[PDB]
Amino acid sequence: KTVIKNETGTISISQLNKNVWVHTELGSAVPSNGLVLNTSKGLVLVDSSWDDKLTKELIEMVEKKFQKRVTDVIITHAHADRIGGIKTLKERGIKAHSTALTAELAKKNGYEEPLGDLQTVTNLKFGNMKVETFYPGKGHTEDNIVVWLPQYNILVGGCLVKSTSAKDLGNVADAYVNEWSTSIENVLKRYRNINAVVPGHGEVGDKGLLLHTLDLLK
Numbered sequence: 001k002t003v004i005k006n007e008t009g010t011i012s013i014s015q016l017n018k019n020v021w022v023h024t025e026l027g028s029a030v031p032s033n034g035l036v037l038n039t040s041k042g043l044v045l046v047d048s049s050w051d052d053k054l055t056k057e058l059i060e061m062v063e064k065k066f067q068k069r070v071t072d073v074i075i076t077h078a079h080a081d082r083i084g085g086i087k088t089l090k091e092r093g094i095k096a097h098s099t100a101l102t103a104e105l106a107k108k109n110g111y112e113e114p115l116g117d118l119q120t121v122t123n124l125k126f127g128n129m130k131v132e133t134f135y136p137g138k139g140h141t142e143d144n145i146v147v148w149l150p151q152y153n154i155l156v157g158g159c160l161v162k163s164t165s166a167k168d169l170g171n172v173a174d175a176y177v178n179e180w181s182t183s184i185e186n187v188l189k190r191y192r193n194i195n196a197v198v199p200g201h202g203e204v205g206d207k208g209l210l211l212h213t214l215d216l217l218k
């Protein structure tokens, strides 16, 4: 699968299973993905969107559809596609989780700050939905984290992980190209049985996206 769009087509949600959807927004056209987790205690997002306008629209779409409030967002690094809606989150009383380093970089770059509560490994539970966050090391950015749903073996790779359609490393201004492969290997070592991998940009895939990223780093 079910795919549902906003009137414009700039925001789309695609169902992976009964309680997990991918959200995708176009920023001006460049698509960006996160997750929507439908839990018994509210909606939890992995990542916001490019700006406040899109973040507001995303929240409004999912609250209406799932008939509950967005309570929490996990911010996976301090680039605009991930954190651009932080002002909206904070003013609505939506908890914005991040590592301390992500918060430090957000502040440095003039964004409002997320909580800085996530450690190298953090285990969260929202209703019955289990979420693990993992900092595997530097790669796409110094601060990038991945998000794991152990009840589904779904990995949110974020922008650390390239989609099949990506034929080069893309934006390496903030990247650590000599450490990115080790960081991917750390993800592969931690999660040895993966059902789906959601990249930050592009189509959902599987463990092959991690291997693709390794190949692009050669």
Ligand SMILES: C[C@H](CS)C(=O)N1CCC[C@@H]1C(=O)O
Binding pocket: 030, 079, 080, 081, 159, 169, 170, 171, 172, 200, 201
């Ligand atoms: C503006 C975003 C922030 S991750 C960006 O750097 N992009 C989006 C598509 C390609 C490029 C990248 O992730 O390498």
Ligand SMILES: [Zn+2]
Binding pocket: 077, 079, 140, 141, 159
């Ligand atoms: Zn980025």
Ligand SMILES: [Zn+2]
Binding pocket: 032, 079, 081, 082, 159, 200, 201
């Ligand atoms: Zn990105």
